[PDB]
């Protein structure tokens with residue numbers, strides 16, 4: 001029995017930037033008041049986890065990364081009321097406390113208890129539940145899913161349907177929800193519109209799914225890797241373009257293709273240049289552009305404000321704009337009811353011990369989502 | 375009868391940047407097909423007219439400036455159907471052709487026939503109706519209202535109520551409608567919200583009027599000239615702040631005052647740095663910031679896209695988002711029914727011949743709107 005005791009288990013520790021993950025034994029403390037200890041079942045490999053290795057995303061090291069996952073509750077601390085031992089759950093990298101001004105607003109989701117704006121790499125109480133070779137290890141976004149067991153605050157976990165398939169619905173913990181919501185909730189794509197989607201990875205394919213569900217008439221995928229085009233068309237793209245095939249900047253190409261600019265554009269890569277290109281390709285009087293990709297730390301973009309004065313709208317969002325704890329269970333129920341598909345995003349399935357091979361697949365351009373199974 | 379004949383009259387010609395206007399005789403050709411010749415009655419002095427003098431707003435010289443005005447139709451060219459000789463009219467610096475994709479869109483107002491994106495300083499047919507000292511003189515934004523007589527395209531004029539007081543309703547041709555619509559139509563300010571307005575000139579005061587009409591609970595005026603505060607409070611500001619009084623950046627001050635950021639902010643000055651400050655002071659998850667001020671020609675701002683990724687919305691607009699020809703007559707009817715006030719914007723009255731004194735008053739900080747009478 002493990003309840004109330006320290007657990008010794010395997011985890012993927014990142015000791016320093018620009019090194020492979022180290023798969024080794026860690027110690028996981030029992031949950032304190034208002035905390036939940038979870039046995040992980042499946043976790044996806046997202047580009048944001050890779051950003052921690054490359055130095056694009058800054059968060060305290062050493063760390064247990066991972067934020068897109070699903071598992072089963074092993075034990076609960078004093079005072080927990082929304083999950084119980086044995087429940088299927090998805091960790092929430094954006095929390096939902098329900099009591100701050102953002103949680104109370106009709107359209108906000110970036111809860112003020114988040115560990116994203118100024119990352120500390122701890123539990124809500126400022127301490128860590130992990131140790132490795134006698135050294136305390138940091139948490140990541142309040143989730144830390146690259147471990148057989150994790151501990152999360154109650155505001156950072158949602159209970160889901162007991163019959164759901166965890167090796168698929170882990171994607172609702174990040175990539176699917178982010179891209180789909182960016183289209184249907186943040187941009188509010190309209191029927192008959194023309195959309196442009198920059199970046200055709202797991203998140204950009206989810207944006208395409210949302211634009212198709214909203215009734216867009218045209219969905220133009222943009223990527224420098226033409227091997228991404230076939231799957232983009234399968235999930236709804238009507239046409240695909242590679243900027244390196246053209247002797248003119250792609251914003252000009254897209255403006256001409258759309259007879260004067262697109263209705264909705266999405267940056268789903270993480271580059272300053274493509275954020276400005278995506279804004280510029282939407283129609284100057286009524287276009288909308290949404291930033292989803294995460295750019296290198298502490299770098300500013302340059303742009304001419306006349307792009308906005310004519311009438312464009314520019315926005316960004318975390319997690320597709322969804323209030324996390326309310327939305328995650330509903331998205332799983334919609335999946336169970338066949339309202340959307342997750343299989344098109346999954347290209348590879350590997351045991352957790354093959355995490356480094358899964359990161360090599362992402363970096364080489366060969367995969368969309370690899371799902372790691374514990 | 376002057377119909378079909380060249381009219382010799384006085385106009386304010388700008389021959390060179392950074393010099394006074396020259397009040398001298400010009401020749402005004404009769405209107406061609408789908409053109410309207412107007413006897414001007416009153417015109418306002420707007421900061422955008424000053425931007426032509428300072429080289430902030432680039433348009434070809436020599437030029438007859440002026441864009442905020444009202445007058446009476448002298449004659450109509452062949453095929454005109456929307457106005458007749460003797461009608462009271464307001465020239466429209468943003469046209470409304472009714473036939474392009476923008477005019478047909480529910481939100482759009484930046485008609486594709488505009489002379490703003492890349493000013494050419496002509497009529498729609500690419501020619502000029504003005505000569506001075508024997509040379510052709512450019513038009514400005516299709517309006518050129520600093521002249522006893524001007525010629526405009528039919529898509530750039532609206533018929534208004536025959537009983538309208540032209541010395542007041544000329545402000546509906548730019549400053550009032552721009553500020554009011556930026557609040558009520560572009561931002562869509564909500565009841566009980568907190569707003570911040572940067573710049574307390576004629577346009578910023580009109581933004582305040584709109585925020586108060588929309589039911590905002592708090593309206594914070596921001597200006598480096600404290601002499602602008604008394605009038606801002608008269609029209610609805612609840613508090614006013616001068617950035618020069620504070621040791622901390624004003625975005626930090628405003629975030630503290632609003633217990634975490636404002637609901638709606640407006641840049642109504644024309645500086646790159648205040649555009650970035652205004653964005654930053656709105657709440658990071660659900661705030662909205664609207665750019666109204668005109669930026670220095672061809673200059674780019676620098677900003678961190680993490681301001682948008684958390685959830686902020688950034689937009690701009692011309693003429694308050696209003697479809698010009700549909701909206702101007704309705705705004706005049708609302709003024710006649712006392713739905714809004716224009717007298718608070720009018721601080722000085724001068725004859726047209728004293729135009730240079732009117733620009734001196736604006737540049738010294740002493741005026742809001744000076745109205746010139748022909």
Ligand SMILES: NC(=O)c1ccc[n+]([C@@H]2O[C@H](COP(=O)([O-])OP(=O)(O)OC[C@H]3O[C@@H](n4cnc5c(N)ncnc54)[C@H](O)[C@@H]3O)[C@@H](O)[C@H]2O)c1
Pocket residue numbers: 046047048051174175178198199200201202203204222223224225228243268269270271274291292293294295317318319320368683
């Ligand atoms: N806002 C959020 O809440 C949120 C959550 C999900 C992920 N993220 C971010 O979303 C982005 C996408 O994540 P993903 O997992 O889909 O990544 P990914 O690496 O699988 O996909 C990115 C795609 O961009 C393409 N690309 C790279 N450089 C390009 C360039 N110069 N021009 C055109 N295409 C280019 C690649 O070929 C690739 O197919 C990442 O930056 C990630 O950090 C954000």
Ligand SMILES: NC(=O)c1ccc[n+]([C@@H]2O[C@H](COP(=O)([O-])OP(=O)(O)OC[C@H]3O[C@@H](n4cnc5c(N)ncnc54)[C@H](O)[C@@H]3O)[C@@H](O)[C@H]2O)c1
Pocket residue numbers: 309420421422425548549552572573574575576577578596597598599602617642643644645648665666667668669691692693694742
């Ligand atoms: N978008 C549009 O359609 C549109 C139409 C109307 C006018 N314009 C622009 O709107 C702006 C305002 O026009 P206006 O006629 O009200 O001008 P104005 O000059 O009367 O008002 C601007 C105000 O900004 C204040 N100011 C200047 N620098 C400042 C700083 N660093 N910080 C804080 N306050 C500062 C001044 O003291 C002044 O009271 C101008 O840039 C004009 O060109 C845009």
